[PDB]
Symmetry: D2
Subunit: 295 residues, 4 copies
């Protein structure tokens, strides 16, 4: 036998950073969970008990904190690029660094109608993420995403005209609830290195904002023919509004809300146009995916 | 042996309800998770296999949906009171109904600066809850709460002057991070029945709003001497602003953020006034509780 | 306003301890999660920013580790008693210590038919717990429990003869699946102090073993008339087999498995005596409780 | 823009099946969570609101239950192959079916030293899984795995000789705790279709058993130089004992247990050879991966 693939590092590194404005007194906080996995000429640590090739995962942890101290942690695309570049430049035998960052929300509080200088609220478990792959000789590959964006619309969702055969019991509908947890990823053009990533820094926050806005507006406004049709409209718009993105991926659960027939009880009408009370279904769920690129 | 206590019913009943405005077209959604447990002359179901005294938990589930169809589900204090009253009035041998409701957030979306008539976002896993205990001959006892309100302030928290002995290693501080998940409960004066609960209906949403506002403003603005001192200020204000509340309870974790000494690496200064990067601690956590009443 | 109740301390303290046998080489591991909350003359920490009365939660954490180093951590009833007694004896103004311990499973591995001296497996997330309340002048109150014991029987469960009215749709059955997560608590006679707790130490492991054995055998062998009837049989047996227990409490979810009618598809028969494939329901669930004492 | 990739179906389908032995009365239960995602000529459902190409996810759910009724659900490799083959054979425009199965443990109870005919216990949240990819023209690709196997050894783990530089603070050790959650995958040789999968059916349970046994014995017995070195030994053995496997993948967290220096308290010695009480760390964790193939 032989090693065909190997990567290792530190997962679940929680990181907080505060920025304190000298002039205004305004403080801004950032909180992340970071994973860094390394590849390189490390197979002998597996096959020969050769630990000399291992940058200790504990050291990778130290390096995450040191890099956060000495560099911006925002946008996460930049921080991940800096972090990944460090490992492949510092260690001759390390040839790839894979950096995953989950950003947690700390939204500035409004108190009596005014923004507070140092108090924050976790307004939802929605995350902003990056996957940054820094590979020697292949530049920097960045996937940006938002996830855990949970939404519901109470009407203007339809699903009819699907295939019907002997396995089919689902009734066609022209008015249903649609609810999902949005997981949306945009994949950037390859960057040649840190200089090029830095040259595009404003685009990262801007494109995240675009992706989120397009998602919410399209969800709210599309009289949806299916999850498939709606998610495609989101993707196509995002591609049209940032040329440095090559693809957009959506993964959407269809979190079903079932009508409840109550007519067995005193002829109570609670279906169709009379449907008011529904049973949210924890499982199973439709799962719909696509990757959209340029034609 | 003998039955000393018994209660039973249905837990984790997910409920959605939509209200559709005939005139404006605006839709409003409500989503809850409901538990109803009953007490009464039911001990023989345990001791003698006498199922004749059991209102099936499946029937309790049906009743939750039927009651939601025929009554307002908002405020949850009212819905719980109606639900609990139903069981003790309908069944001669049922003498108490214990109703727990967890309300999930579905906040109306703003699209292009305008509120959308039928699209919603889960803006955080913060919950609004009630515990409604309807007991024959003892009226209706309601505990209202908010929970999972997660907040952080980056300065203006202190902790010094605590007891120091041979078990103590904690250094005094005049500037630390304070973060918590707020669990706050206000206990209403006993209500004599549904008429009295209904007579106070506007107060339930209003007092929830007060509790939340006081929590956020006090957290943000108090130069905190301790979690103990700050949570007491919250409680005292809430009691002063709603006379129909008898007690306020807080349960607050102190979700620690530790400084990281990096001076071992190139003399990097990251402690005290130089502290920028911190290690959020998943565990353990301080846990601070109090119940505040009127003097 | 005034403080009506207050308690505070450290939650979620993870603790591991290893015992190494000098003579045999056999090692034994223990892992727990500990919470200690204190009460006493501490109200001024809430009302007057008086931290002088606060034994820091950080110090409580230190004390948990120190006590584990200097004392047995098994049985958890003993460790909790020692821990709680420490706080009320050490601190004049602390009058109660509330100690919760969750014990995690590390079962010795069998390798090639022989027990291994230092390798362990988490064989299930079933927990063994204690709640130990040490109150000055009121001795030591111990509640022992097992929880997260998940079981299923595929037949020999019935449920018929329950109340039927206009809210009822549940069909009577003489053969159903029964599955639950067992939460069972036995409450000990009050102990006067550490000497009396220590005098009964062998009974704690023995009674836990009895409770578990009775639970499993009764579940497996009872042709169950209801969850109510079966859980009562468990309790009554436990009380009969340990006289130092005053009450037994069970809390049992009925984790429903629904038949699936497939007759719409090629007349497939999958109900009643033909039922083979079922839909496990995540929610809702029946929830059945009782506390059984001596007659 | 254009669809570059698309797949959709039903996730989180919970399935129970009971087998009842006519002659012995012995019952055997199986419980799974199933996901089926389909690919094919379905892009117009995304681009043109063409639902005619969609086999409804609800219908996929029905099909899972019907297939479980009419076929063995064990071994999961077989069930997944049957399920996947159904979709690509039944639907001309569906060209791939991706089937994920998570198998849940229901281990037969032993009561009074004898196996019980119809009562079961969830002995751990360890799972047995398969990923079965059935692609028209490319046969059946099966990945089998075990996951959530949580283990700990209290000694005979070492980690020294790793790279040391200005980012390193980790001390070398010749005696530490090692704990992990095992995720192990074995990838089968491509199968040409159902006939070939069926021809190897006994090998699936046998190879799962081998993988588990090798994992546990190697973990217990290897005086470990690193997670890397130990996991490689596991893989190499598995490959040597089943020739129809092409690769073995391990993903192992290093779930750290930290020594606690208590010497600040009365000179208490709890480090090095005196280490008894440890602090289990929830995060961060080392994460070590490799894929091993034949040389
Ligand atoms: O939007 C939907 N897409 C689907 O593929 C589907 N299948 N059942 N319901 C559905 N809804
Ligand atoms: O606010 C605090 N209260 C406490 O009781 C405590 N103990 N350690 N740190 C603390 N902070
Ligand atoms: O055992 C049961 N007890 C109950 O109270 C009940 N209600 N529905 N099904 C039930 N099963
Ligand atoms: O087994 C280990 N492998 C590693 O790569 C490592 N890094 N820190 N500790 C470690 N232990
Ligand atoms: Na390199
Ligand atoms: Na009554
Ligand atoms: Na005392
Ligand atoms: Na096909």
């Amino acid at each position: 036998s032989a090693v065909k693939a190997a990567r290792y590092g530190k997962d679940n590194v929680r990181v907080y950073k505060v920025h304190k404005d000298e002039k205004t007194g305004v403080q801004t906080v950032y909180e992340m969970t970071v994973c860094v996995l390394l590849e390189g000429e490390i197979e002998t640590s597996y096959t020969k008990a050769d630990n000399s090739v291992i940058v200790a995962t504990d050291s990778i942890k130290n390096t995450i904190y040191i890099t956060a101290k000495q560099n911006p942690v925002t946008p996460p695309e930049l921080f991940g690029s800096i972090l990944g570049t460090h490992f492949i430049e510092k260690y001759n035998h390390i040839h790839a660094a894979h950096v995953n960052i989950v950003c947690h929300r700390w939204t500035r509080m409004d108190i009596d109608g005014k923004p507070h200088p140092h108090s924050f609220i976790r307004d939802s478990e929605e995350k902003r993420n990056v996957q940054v792959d820094v590979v020697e000789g292949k530049g920097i590959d960045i996937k940006s995403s938002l996830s855990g964006l949970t939404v519901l619309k109470s009407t203007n969702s339809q699903f009819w005209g699907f295939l019907r055969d002997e396995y089919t019991t689902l009734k066609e509908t022209w008015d249903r609830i649609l609810s999902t947890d949005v997981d949306a990823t945009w994949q950037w053009k390859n960057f040649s290195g840190l200089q090029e990533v830095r040259s595009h820094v404003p685009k990262f926050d801007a494109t995240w904002a675009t992706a989120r806005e397009v998602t919410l507006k399209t969800f709210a406004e599309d009289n949806s023919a299916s999850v498939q049709a709606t998610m495609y409209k989101m993707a196509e718009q995002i591609l049209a509004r940032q040329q440095l993105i090559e693809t957009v991926e959506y993964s959407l659960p269809n979190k079903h809300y079932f009508e409840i027939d109550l007519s067995w009880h005193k002829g109570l009408q609670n279906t169709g146009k009379n449907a008011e009370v529904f049973a949210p279904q924890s499982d199973p769920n439709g799962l719909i995916k696509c990757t959209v690129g340029r034609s």
